[PDB]
Each structure stands twice: as C-alpha cells, then as structure tokens.
Amino acid sequence: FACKTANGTAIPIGGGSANVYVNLAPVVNVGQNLVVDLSTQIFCHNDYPETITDYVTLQRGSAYGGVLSNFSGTVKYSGSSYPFPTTSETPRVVYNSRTDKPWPVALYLTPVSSAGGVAIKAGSLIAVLILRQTNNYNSDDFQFVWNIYANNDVVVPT
Numbered sequence: 001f002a003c004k005t006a007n008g009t010a011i012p013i014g015g016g017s018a019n020v021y022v023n024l025a026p027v028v029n030v031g032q033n034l035v036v037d038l039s040t041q042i043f044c045h046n047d048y049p050e051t052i053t054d055y056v057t058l059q060r061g062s063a064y065g066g067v068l069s070n071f072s073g074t075v076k077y078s079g080s081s082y083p084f085p086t087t088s089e090t091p092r093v094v095y096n097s098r099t100d101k102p103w104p105v106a107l108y109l110t111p112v113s114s115a116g117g118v119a120i121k122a123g124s125l126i127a128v129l130i131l132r133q134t135n136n137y138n139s140d141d142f143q144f145v146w147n148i149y150a151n152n153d154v155v156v157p158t
C-alpha cells in the first residue's frame with residue numbers, strides 16, 4: 001500500500017509525509033462553503049490484492065492558520081460527515097485494487113461571523129490530515145501524513 005499526490009509526490013510502503021498545495025475559491029461569503037476536495041489530490045492503491053485487503057481511515061484532521069481562526073469545518077469521508085478538526089477516527093475504506101483510487105476526503109469550511117478580509121493567507125498551512133493504513137495480513141499500522149497548504153489568499157467579503 002502506498003499513496004501519491006496529483007503532481008506525483010509519493011509516500012511509499014510504510015508511510016511518511018507529503019505536502020499538498022491546493023487552489024482555493026478566492027472569495028467565500030459568510031453562509032457559503034469553501035470546499036477543499038482532497039479526492040482529486042490524493043490517490044492510493046493496494047500492492048497485493050490477490051491476498052491482502054488494506055483498511056484506510058482518516059485517523060485525524062487538524063486545522064491551522066486561517067482555517068483554525070476563521071472557519072467552522074466539516075470533513076466528508078467516503079460519503080459521511082464529521083466535525084473538522086476531528087473528534088474521532090473515521091470508519092474504514094477498503095483498498096482492494098492495484099488501480100489508484102482517490103482518498104475520499106473533502107473539507108467543507110464556512111466562515112465564522114468574525115471572519116472578514118484575508119481569511120486564509122497564500123502559502124500558509126491550512127490542514128494536516130492523517131491517513132491510517134492497516135490490513136488483514138500482518139501487524140502493519142502506518143501513517144500517511146498530508147500537510148495541506150493554500151496556493152492563494154481567500155477573501156471573506158465584509
């Protein structure tokens with residue numbers, strides 16, 4: 001089991017970490033969602049589907065900088081919604097193919113009432129998402145750490 005980003009940055013068997021640079025909607029009004037869809041950014045696969053089933057969860061999702069200060073978050077994992085920053089490990093997603101499958105994580109961020117102006121700064125860390133991988137074969141328990149960065153400023157109109 002290993003993962004890669006849309007630009008080809010890989011995290012090999014055993015886990016590790018990688019940076020993910022995301023383009024964000026430049027203008028987000030109070031009452032609207034800023035959607036950060038990681039399913040177009042992070043892809044994973046099973047290296048031995050003939051014998052092994054891989055189990056994948058979002059173990060933790062943490063908010064940073066402007067996302068932590070200016071937004072009220074929700075994380076959607078494989079069609080179910082949870083608070084973001086996270087309060088528990090999600091259920092598992094099964095990886096049973098050698099063909100790349102997107103990691104089904106999306107952040108839904110709505111401005112808090114005090115937000116206004118430059119709510120997210122270009123180049124800042126916005127989130128850290130922990131992908132946890134286990135299997136039905138051995139004792140492997142690996143973490144694939146995704147450091148999410150904003151490519152641009154996000155303005156919340158006043």
Ligand SMILES: CCCCCCCO[C@H]1O[C@H](CO)[C@@H](F)[C@H](O)[C@@H]1O
Nearest residue numbers: 001013014046047048052054135140
């Ligand atoms: C004849 C025995 C060969 C065993 C191959 C083991 C390959 O291990 C990797 O891929 C597995 C499937 O994706 C993961 F279960 C592991 O955790 C590990 O990532």
